[PDB]
Amino acid sequence: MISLIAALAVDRVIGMENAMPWNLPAELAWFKRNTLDKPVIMGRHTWESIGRPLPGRKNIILSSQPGTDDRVTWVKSVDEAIAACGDVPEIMVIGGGRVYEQFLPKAQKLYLTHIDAEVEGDTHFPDYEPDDWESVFSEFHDADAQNSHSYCFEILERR
Amino acid sequence: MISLIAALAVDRVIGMENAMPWNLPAELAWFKRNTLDKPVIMGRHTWESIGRPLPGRKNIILSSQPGTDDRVTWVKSVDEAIAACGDVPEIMVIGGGRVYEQFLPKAQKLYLTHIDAEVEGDTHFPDYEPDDWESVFSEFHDADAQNSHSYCFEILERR
Numbered sequence: 001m002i003s004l005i006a007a008l009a010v011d012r013v014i015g016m017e018n019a020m021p022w023n024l025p026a027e028l029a030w031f032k033r034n035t036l037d038k039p040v041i042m043g044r045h046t047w048e049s050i051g052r053p054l055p056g057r058k059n060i061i062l063s064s065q066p067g068t069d070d071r072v073t074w075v076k077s078v079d080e081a082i083a084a085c086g087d088v089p090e091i092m093v094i095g096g097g098r099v100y101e102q103f104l105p106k107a108q109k110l111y112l113t114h115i116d117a118e119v120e121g122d123t124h125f126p127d128y129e130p131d132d133w134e135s136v137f138s139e140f141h142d143a144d145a146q147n148s149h150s151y152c153f154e155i156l157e158r159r
Numbered sequence: 160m161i162s163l164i165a166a167l168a169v170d171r172v173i174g175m176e177n178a179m180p181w182n183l184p185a186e187l188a189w190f191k192r193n194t195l196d197k198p199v200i201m202g203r204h205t206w207e208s209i210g211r212p213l214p215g216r217k218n219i220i221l222s223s224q225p226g227t228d229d230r231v232t233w234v235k236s237v238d239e240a241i242a243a244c245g246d247v248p249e250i251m252v253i254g255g256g257r258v259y260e261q262f263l264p265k266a267q268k269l270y271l272t273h274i275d276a277e278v279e280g281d282t283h284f285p286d287y288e289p290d291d292w293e294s295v296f297s298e299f300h301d302a303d304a305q306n307s308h309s310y311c312f313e314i315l316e317r318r
């Protein structure tokens with residue numbers, strides 16, 4: 001099955017011109033826990049943002065342009081992206097905006113992190129119909145010594 | 160000689176307890192380059208935000224309450240903190256607020272990072288009359304894919 005995993009600020013903002021203005025090691029820990037040992041599909045801008053391949057995951061980059069790193073797999077279509085995953089129970093799509101838009105229709109589950117940050121965004125997570133999804137897990141946490149903002153983890157399954 | 164190193168938001172706002180709302184790996188690199196191989200003095204809140212002893216530095220915690228951890232040095236007074244440093248060319252004071260207030264009188268240099276972020280806060284870096292200080296180095300950087308805000312490194316020497 002295909003799952004989308006994203007960190008959304010207020011109004012579903014997911015990206016800005018520069019790095020997001022938050023320091024959330026706990027959110028990254030959740031991201032790692034939910035993607036480890038699974039293929040991850042991302043767009044080129046997300047790839048460039050991370051800076052290196054994610055350890056212990058098969059990194060797949062969906063892009064019309066040519067491959068710059070021998071450490072990951074470059075694909076040119078959703079179909080190719082999928083085929084590169086092989087036979088695994090779950091494929092994780094990690095962004096950005098355009099990639100989420102192309103995979104939403106095929107997605108069965110969403111792993112969302114809602115962050116209480118008001119920012120002017122560049123890209124936003126596609127509008128989802130809350131009547132179409134069932135929340136099966138939610139957990140709220142306040143900002144603390146290491147995390148700059150409050151956040152809530154949520155997992156939704158398609159009804 | 161004693162030096163204070165701090166990251167300030169607009170209006171000189173500094174962290175109190177929760178992590179600051181910015182992601183500046185280039186700023187932490189600056190922090191590391193300037194404190195490596197030197198003793199660092201910090202208060203209890205800063206210690207909690209770091210979460211572990213900084214490698215390659217002698218970690219001294221100035222606090223009234225008790226030494227949780229054995230990997231660092233716990234002192235109850237300014238005099239004791241200085242003594243624990245031994246005889247080195249430069250002692251780095253890394254915050255927070257009350258710690259900067261206690262050492263400013265004794266400081267000969269300031270390594271400051273001015274960040275273009277408006278943050279609401281109670282705490283401010285102590286008032287320094289820059290005419291008692293000579294700005295000796297200044298280098299501005301714009302925000303990018305990995306750094307959430309613009310920042311300017313500055314070094315001042317006590318005249």
Ligand SMILES: CN(Cc1cnc2nc(N)nc(N)c2n1)c1ccc(C(=O)N[C@@H](CCC(=O)O)C(=O)O)cc1
Pocket residue numbers: 005006007027028029031032046049050054055093094095112113
């Ligand atoms: C810019 N970026 C994209 C990013 C960030 N947070 C997200 N958070 C969620 N929930 N979902 C995403 N798709 C997401 N994507 C990043 C940047 C760094 C790391 C990262 O360092 N991850 C380490 C975990 C943190 C660490 O080792 O420092 C990992 O092993 O996943 C991940 C994603």
Ligand SMILES: CN(Cc1cnc2nc(N)nc(N)c2n1)c1ccc(C(=O)N[C@@H](CCC(=O)O)C(=O)O)cc1
Pocket residue numbers: 164165166186187188190191205208209213214252253254271272
């Ligand atoms: C919360 N905190 C206090 C902190 C942060 N930035 C500062 N920045 C400046 N300029 N001055 C300070 N006093 C300062 N203090 C921290 C948190 C983490 C690390 C840290 O991880 N430092 C690693 C470098 C980054 C990494 O490897 O994780 C190091 O080796 O110094 C440092 C300070």
Ligand SMILES: [Ca+2]
Pocket residue numbers: 134135136137
């Ligand atoms: Ca439910």
Ligand SMILES: [Cl-]
Pocket residue numbers: 042043044045046047095096097099
């Ligand atoms: Cl992307």
Ligand SMILES: [Cl-]
Pocket residue numbers: 201202203204205206254255256258
């Ligand atoms: Cl402190």
